Amino acid sequence: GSSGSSGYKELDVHLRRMESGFGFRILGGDEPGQPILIGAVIAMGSADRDGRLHPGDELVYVDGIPVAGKTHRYVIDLMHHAARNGQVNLTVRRKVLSGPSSG
C-alpha cells in the first residue's frame, strides 16, 4: 500500500502475422519519453478484426520490451523483430475513470 490501489489498467493485445501483419500504426514518441499512443487502427484490418485496440490507446509493451522512455524509432526496430516472430503482443493501458457531469 501507499503506492496507488487503483488508477489505470493495462490490456494485452496479441496479433498474429498470417493475413496482413498487424493492422495498427504507431505515432508520437518524438522525444525519449513522449507518449506512444496508437497512431491509427487500420479499419477492417487484421487488428480491428481482432477487436482489441482503439486509435490513441497508449502503448506500454511491444513483443516484451517496454516502449516507455524510448522513441518512435525504438518501436520501429521492435516491429522489424516481431514480424519475424510472426506475431506480436501489444500491451496498451488507459486510466480507469468514472464521474458524470453532462451526457
From Swiss-Prot:
Residues 12-94 form the PDZ domain. Coiled coil: none annotated. Specifically expressed in brain. Disulfide bonds: none annotated. The modification Phosphotyrosine is found at residue 61. It is found in: Cytoplasm; Late endosome; Synapse, Synaptosome; Cell membrane. Belongs to the MAGUK family. It is linked to Nephrotic syndrome 15: A form of nephrotic syndrome, a renal disease clinically characterized by severe proteinuria, resulting in complications such as hypoalbuminemia, hyperlipidemia and edema. Kidney biopsies show non-specific histologic changes such as focal segmental glomerulosclerosis and diffuse mesangial proliferation. NPHS15 is an autosomal recessive form with onset in the first months of life. Disease severity is variable. Some patients show rapid progression to end-stage renal failure. Interacts (via its WW domains) with DRPLA. Interacts (via its second PDZ domain) with PTEN (via unphosphorylated C-terminus); this interaction diminishes the degradation rate of PTEN. Interacts (via guanylate kinase domain) with DLGAP1. Interacts (via the PDZ domains) with GRIN2A, GRID2 and NLGN1. Interacts with CTNND2, CTNNB1, MAGUIN-1, ACVR2A, SMAD2 and SMAD3. Part of a complex consisting of MAGI2/ARIP1, ACVR2A, ACVR1B and SMAD3. May interact with HTR2A. Interacts with IGSF9, RAPGEF2 and HTR4. Identified in a complex with ACTN4, CASK, IQGAP1, NPHS1, SPTAN1 and SPTBN1. Seems to act as a scaffold molecule at synaptic junctions by assembling neurotransmitter receptors and cell adhesion proteins. Plays a role in nerve growth factor (NGF)-induced recruitment of RAPGEF2 to late endosomes and neurite outgrowth. May play a role in regulating activin-mediated signaling in neuronal cells. Enhances the ability of PTEN to suppress AKT1 activation. Plays a role in receptor-mediated clathrin-dependent endocytosis which is required for ciliogenesis. This is Membrane-associated guanylate kinase, WW and PDZ domain-containing protein 2. The chain holds residues 774 to 863 of 1455 of the full protein.
